[PDB]
Design a protein around this ligand. Structure first.
Ligand SMILES: CC1(C)O[C@@H]2C[C@H]3[C@@H]4CCC5=CC(=O)C=C[C@]5(C)[C@@]4(F)[C@@H](O)C[C@]3(C)[C@]2(C(=O)CO)O1
Lengths: 11, 248
């Protein structure tokens, strides 16, 4: 999974 | 109180600047690299925007990531089309206030074909005289227009949120003070524009992948886009991405 995108969505 | 449309207006991302240095002549490499950096920042803002959409965070996290991952190019190109429609009536591509691409600057390697495809998006706003509220509703539907062939983890939630914003687009149409027959034809024309985005965005994505895989072109990508592109790439060539069409 794209880390930056996931970090944004899970705060 | 508040109306859904009023909420979409206040969460719309502010336009970002490119910082492009036009002191010296343009090059296809420097221009594409600057646009990708700008694009990565706009996608971050798009994630912030999507998280504030009513209903979106009711989806499974994996579904939130899939939708944004499958539709980021269509969101960016649709917003570019809108900015170009309001700034130059579709005559120039307004990537950013400090980076406007007129018909001359498009005459660069790798630039012309893709920029003509994006002008065609802006010209559709012109032909149809799209309103801001119509545009905001259509842009949410783009986020909800590309899904995996095997479906989402929370399909029930997804189906209902998509209908919520289909109805909201209708409300935006009714605001134009038309009768029933006119509002249905208007809805038909706008859902046709949404369907056409899949093909017009296809060529933009195919070319984005091309510049990303062939490192010889020296095109720079931000980490945000690099991660998304590389994870998105094997899914397309495998044929597991299905668009959602209003008309077959
Ligand atoms: C050759 C050209 C013009 O077409 C391709 C599609 C372009 C995108 C179209 C939509 C958009 C709207 C903007 O406001 C800012 C950035 C982008 C995302 C974008 F511009 C840049 O992200 C650069 C892209 C990939 C692209 C590349 O593939 C470069 O690698 O450049």
């Amino acid at each position: 999974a794209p880390a930056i995108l996931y970090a944004l969505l899970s705060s | 109180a508040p109306t859904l449309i009023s909420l979409l207006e206040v969460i719309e991302p502010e336009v970002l600047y490119s910082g492009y240095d036009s002191t010296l002549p343009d090059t296809s490499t420097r221009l594409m690299s600057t646009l990708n950096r700008l694009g990565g920042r706009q996608v971050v803002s798009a994630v912030k925007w999507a998280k504030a959409l009513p209903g979106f965070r009711n989806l499974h996290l994996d579904d939130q990531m899939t939708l944004l991952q499958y539709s980021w190019m269509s969101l960016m190109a649709f917003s570019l089309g809108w900015r170009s429609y309001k700034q130059s009536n579709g005559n120039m591509l307004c990537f950013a206030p400090d980076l406007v691409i007129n018909e001359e600057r498009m005459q660069l390697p790798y630039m012309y074909d893709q920029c003509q495809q994006m002008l065609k998006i802006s010209s559709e706003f012109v032909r149809l005289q799209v309103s801001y509220d119509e545009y905001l509703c259509m842009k949410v539907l783009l986020l909800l227009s590309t899904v995996p062939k095997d479906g989402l983890k929370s399909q029930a939630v997804f189906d209902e949120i998509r209908m919520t914003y289909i109805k909201e687009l209708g409300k935006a149409i009714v605001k134009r003070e038309g009768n029933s027959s006119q509002n249905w034809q208007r809805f038909y024309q706008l859902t046709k524009l949404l369907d056409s985005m899949h093909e017009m965005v296809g060529g933009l994505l195919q070319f984005c992948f091309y510049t990303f895989v062939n490192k010889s072109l020296s095109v720079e990508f931000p980490e945000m886009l690099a991660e998304i592109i590389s994870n998105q790439l094997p899914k397309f060539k495998a044929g597991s991405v299905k668009p959602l069409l209003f008309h077959q």
